[PDB]
Amino acid sequence: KLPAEFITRPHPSKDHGKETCTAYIHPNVLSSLEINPGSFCTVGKIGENGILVIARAGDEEVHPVNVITLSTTIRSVGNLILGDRLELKKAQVQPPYATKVTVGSLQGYNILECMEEKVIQKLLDDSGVIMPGMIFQNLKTKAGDESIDVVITDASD
Amino acid sequence: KLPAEFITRPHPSKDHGKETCTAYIHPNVLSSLEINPGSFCTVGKIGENGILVIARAGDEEVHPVNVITLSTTIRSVGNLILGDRLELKKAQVQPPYATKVTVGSLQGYNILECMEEKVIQKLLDDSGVIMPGMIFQNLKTKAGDESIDVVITDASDFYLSPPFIFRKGSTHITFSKETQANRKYNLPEPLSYAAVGGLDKEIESLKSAIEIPLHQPTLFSSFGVSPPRGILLHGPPGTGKTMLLRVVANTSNAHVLTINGPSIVSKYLGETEAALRDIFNEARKYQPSIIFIDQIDSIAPNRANDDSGEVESRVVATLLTLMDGMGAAGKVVVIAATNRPNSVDPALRRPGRFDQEVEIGIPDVDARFDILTKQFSRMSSDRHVLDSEAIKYIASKTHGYVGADLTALCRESVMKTIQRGLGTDANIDKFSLKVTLKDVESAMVDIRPSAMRVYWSDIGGQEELKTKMKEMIQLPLEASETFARLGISAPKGVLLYGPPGCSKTLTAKALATESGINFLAVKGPEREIFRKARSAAPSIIFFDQIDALSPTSAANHVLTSLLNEIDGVEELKGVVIVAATNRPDEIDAALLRPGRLDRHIYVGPPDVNARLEILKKCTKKFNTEESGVDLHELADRTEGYSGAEVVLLCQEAGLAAIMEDLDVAKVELRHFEKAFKGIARGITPEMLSYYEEFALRSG
Amino acid sequence: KLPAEFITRPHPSKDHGKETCTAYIHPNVLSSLEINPGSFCTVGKIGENGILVIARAGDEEVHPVNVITLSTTIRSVGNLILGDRLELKKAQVQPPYATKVTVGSLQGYNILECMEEKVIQKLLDDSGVIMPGMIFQNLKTKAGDESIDVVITDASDFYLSPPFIFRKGSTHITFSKETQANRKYNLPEPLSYAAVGGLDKEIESLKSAIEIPLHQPTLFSSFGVSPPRGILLHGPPGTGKTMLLRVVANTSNAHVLTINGPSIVSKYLGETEAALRDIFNEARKYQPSIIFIDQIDSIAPNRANDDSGEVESRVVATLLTLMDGMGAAGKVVVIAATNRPNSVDPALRRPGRFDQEVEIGIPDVDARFDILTKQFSRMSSDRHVLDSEAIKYIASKTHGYVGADLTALCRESVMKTIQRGLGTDANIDKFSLKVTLKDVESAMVDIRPSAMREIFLEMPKVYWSDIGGQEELKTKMKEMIQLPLEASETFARLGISAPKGVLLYGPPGCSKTLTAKALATESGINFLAVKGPEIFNKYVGESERAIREIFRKARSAAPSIIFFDQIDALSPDRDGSSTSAANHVLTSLLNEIDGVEELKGVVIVAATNRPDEIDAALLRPGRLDRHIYVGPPDVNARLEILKKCTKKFNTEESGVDLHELADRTEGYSGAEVVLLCQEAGLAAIMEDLDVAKVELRHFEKAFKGIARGITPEMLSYYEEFALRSG
Ligand SMILES: Nc1ncnc2c1ncn2[C@@H]1O[C@H](COP(=O)(O)OP(=O)(O)OP(=O)(O)O)[C@@H](O)[C@H]1O
Ligand SMILES: Nc1ncnc2c1ncn2[C@@H]1O[C@H](COP(=O)(O)OP(=O)(O)OP(=O)(O)O)[C@@H](O)[C@H]1O
Ligand SMILES: Nc1ncnc2c1ncn2[C@@H]1O[C@H](COP(=O)(O)OP(=O)(O)OP(=O)(O)O)[C@@H](O)[C@H]1O
Fold first, then answer.
1. How many contacts, defined by CB atoms under 8 Å, are there between B and C?
2. Could you tell me which of B205, B209, B237, B239 has the C-alpha nearest to residue B371?
3. What is the interface size between A and B, counted as CB pairs within 8 Å?
4. Under DSSP, is residue B150 helix (H, G, I), strand (E, B) or coil?
């Protein structure tokens, strides 16, 4: 086969459990890449730096080998628009544990009615891989506003 | 994988002692090349030489597989610049122990604070393996708070030099002043500003252009987007582009890449996009990176022509998109070298991409003198005579040409001197040979200037017009305060009308020689050339013919229509302007108004002095004592013939001699008489009378 | 492992006999070849067979595996060249015994002071066997004689020469014959500097320039200037550069490690460069005296062309950046020989090691008879004619013949001799046959060499007697052609700058083309007819390439002269604004004609009928120096033309004086006279079949056939154009 190119694609569902750090890769190409499911792989546009993400088994048949599935978050890290070229690398480095992080949502006034725990539970499902570019939806129950979002700023470590 | 390509990168943390003779190769690559961590390996540019440094495990795996970290000291030994190709060879020869080594100092300080109780140990703790380079920058060694450099020049007891491991007691330490490494190994020497020519303004502009983004890119990124990155070098070929880019790469510690361009693109394959993307990704991998482009015009010619190429369009598009996507806050600069500015693609030469334009001007006599003195100082001058006056005379005698293959003149002069000395002294040693100047002059005459493909003694001048020409070239220029305060427009030259065979060409050549500035004649029947007059500024512009364009025909009409714009440009900076004509009556009436052509000067046959000078110059090829000519009777006989028929006379006499006695040793009076009888009264009196009438009616 | 090819190396130690027939084969290679040191190993060229050499231990590990050793001077017998690939074979058969051996010394006068006590035992104590042809440096011989050598002429009792067995007292040894060995062995012969004549002037400059670096180059050690490591030999095709390279390689008696290849590349991306890197590393380590790089243009052309810069760009860049090593001390001289001078990369010619740019021209004028005599002596000293006058005459004839053409002429003369001998003596032995001038002339007629090839058309024969015209034009043309063509040192020393260009303008039918044909026939002895519109091509870039090729590649220094039939059809572009084929070809011609002043005496000639279109960005002071009016023939010229055309007729029988006819035809020219004579002859043939005479009535009848003649309007136009030109 020799697949030298990859294309980003969105998940059919919102995937509430695993918005971030989810990249579906076909088992055939993954096996040929000598990459285990529990191994980090960096993906990014050709000619630019890659973004590491854990390898995931493909959704059985009727799944194209070329495409890689992401959900609204990994693409937004490098402003990756659907259909852009992608490159895969097997080089992974263990990152240090995060500490003293700060989060601040754009287009929103500083308010403390988020209860400060509902957003925390979303980060638990991330299971690592923290980067300054993250876009979420924070569900509901926030001042009765449907069109709101939360973005992480950076980490002080 | 089989990695056949490797690059270099300085190690962080500023390691001391252990930094030398270490190559942190990737463990996967180290095991693949069947070389143990505790072994000696050859690291260096492919096919050139080796350095024999000890390989390393590589510590963590965060470092890229292809790159291997090497210290700056080892790289400077073989002039291993950043990004140079590297090759690993498994075979190794055991290095013998060093004995009776010698060490020197790069700086002029010698025999000062010779402690040697840690310096000697320094040569031992650094994993041994002493190379001729040993560029030391670790620790803080000083004598009165001043940095010094120590170089182990020689160590005598297919690589750059045989490897020797320093030992504490098996060798003796001797200190002396050498300022350079030993020449036996013939190691490459990094280029410095002392060796290169002066080019003060050009080198200063290039240094500023390179320095401005290099040290403060964050401020540019914060202030705005798209900082200047592209640097374009153009001008006349041979002035020096590869040498100066090599110099600025050597003096910088940032990553550099060699991009010729024909090798980057694969013919009939269209892989130039991928190649350029990979090159720019590699450049972006390291924050300090320099991009060098050679012959960018050939790679990407003008898109207007239909023969530019689909591959040219593809490479232009990929270059544009990569420059768009390279980012703003990055510390990246692109250097592009081109032959001619015209061949540069118009889209590339647009604001926001290559605004910082650097051009190399044509060297003058002062620049030639400076570069000659620099080359003579660089060359071993134990015997060569300094002779500032001789160098100045040689520079002045040489025709104005760009600094192309000037070292070739010295090389051929050396060859001629060697050839003379061998015959003179029957294969004697070079120290007994002597170097003269006649061989240099002969070589300079033989090689001739190659810029294009006259002297005041060669071409005379009339004294009547000397005062007027001196006034026109001095009063408007030397003393402009009077004109500025009185609001008086410059004379803007005069109109010269004369027969084609008169001294008008001789007068123009005399003016050009007296000005001392090289110029290109503009033919009559022949915008871009006129625009270059302002860009250069101090020069002379002469028009061979203006009569044709005064009233091909289309070219003449274009020239006389664009003369209106010429006058407007020439109004701001008149400097000096001259022209020649054959039919004065065809000139425009509006062109004779005051403020444009203040005066009109008639030119005729050359005077007695100019005729005698021309006769002497044309007879110089022949002989005078054997011929018996007094160089004055011929002038008296042919005073009124023309200002150029003497060349025809000499050619006819030479042809007659070479067909009457084959090889010639002297020229008899018979050939001169035959030449004189061949052509008689070339000029006409009626047209000279018409010129006199025009001069009288002009005023 | 598995070394397919091996390279020989001379023994560093010098010793008579001991070094002969010794091969220090590596023990690993010797063991892997299943051959013991007590067995003979075959060593020879890749295309040739091996030779009988006994194996040796290999002197431990001082000699690398890939390199072997051989005798220093025995290789000269087979013309073996250092650094070339060798073959090793295991099959070997014991040769039989030989007797009545014969040997010949290099010196002409043999049979002197032959003690025979040492010479006989040398062939037994050298650990070798007798081979047809023997070379050895030896030492001082006898008394009052320098170092001399003896060559085994013959040894009579799928290999280059049959091996034998030699002993001391069981066979008789005699010496006779000459230096040259028997040709029945098919062995090659050594090539020396004497084997080449004529070029020698170029050779003197090249031997000096190559030699200072190859000998003691310590003079430029402390100078630090760029080191000279090349000559950049080039010239016209067939000039004989390969034989000069072979001579300089053989006479250097040193390593000649090099390879040419037909633009050899590799499919692997890295191997195509690693091969060259390994070759250069070996050259640095093995220090060959001369390295040969042939056909640089084929392997590294100019980067201006799009397809030319592929692959070779990185190769030439690495070669340039690598050849700048081992400065001062160190020869490592590389020789670059190419056919096309301007096709080489300008960046390659930029460095100063090719500043000399020695170019060898085709033989001409002098030394041609010398090289012909040398080649005749080399082929056979007997059974051939040796006349100085005949050789001088054949050298003067066909001035455009290159040395390769001379060799082809000699071969065709031998073929003609063979054919004549067979046809005369009914397949007799050809040993007694002798060469004469008739076969040489027949060969010269029938060869049609490559000098005139690629054209397939030749100008018709013409002589000075066949044309009678104004003596002034002929004298001026002879002065223009013969003076610069005969020699150039007088022009160079005296500074005379010949125009090297003449424009022939005049009324039609004035025989300017015929004058050019006669000029080419007389002095040039070579014609290169080029047509203006012919060089035009449908493709935009093909016309420029074609004109550049016809201007440069086909140009020969003394032989070739280019003649333009109608130069007025190129410069005028009519209503052409920009991007026109005519404008492009005019610009190319101007660029390729403004950079030449003397060069090689091209002395171009052009003819035209309408000069008014010539003055379109073409008329320049370097080309308008010489103007020829080329006027109509006068009464004397017309009378001469009438006499020449009437020679076939019977003037005495007819009684015509051929004077009043010329007087009546005052406004006519040569073409009209020829036409009227032809019409009169045709009428005479028609009226009464063959009569072999012409009467006055025929001329009267043919007079009305001529249509007026040269009208005064074009004559006045030509006169005013000449006055304007001045
Ligand atoms: N300003 C200078 N000072 C000293 N030497 C110079 C200078 N300019 C040129 N040279 C000499 O002339 C050589 C030619 O310059 P270089 O090799 O850089 O070529 P280039 O002019 O960039 O190339 P091209 O012929 O393609 O225009 C240099 O290698 C150097 O030896
Ligand atoms: N000095 C000489 N004396 C005799 N023959 C010579 C001499 N110089 C050259 N020749 C002749 O030139 C020919 C040598 O041909 P060679 O193999 O050198 O190729 P070439 O045609 O010259 O090559 P190229 O076109 O590549 O330069 C032979 O016919 C040889 O006789
Ligand atoms: N002096 C002469 N002797 C013999 N034949 C002559 C002489 N002058 C002219 N002729 C004849 O007249 C012809 C005129 O020359 P040619 O036909 O080559 O044309 P041309 O004068 O060069 O003109 P065009 O410019 O049309 O080519 C000659 O070929 C020849 O047949």
1. 116
2. B239
3. 18
4. strand
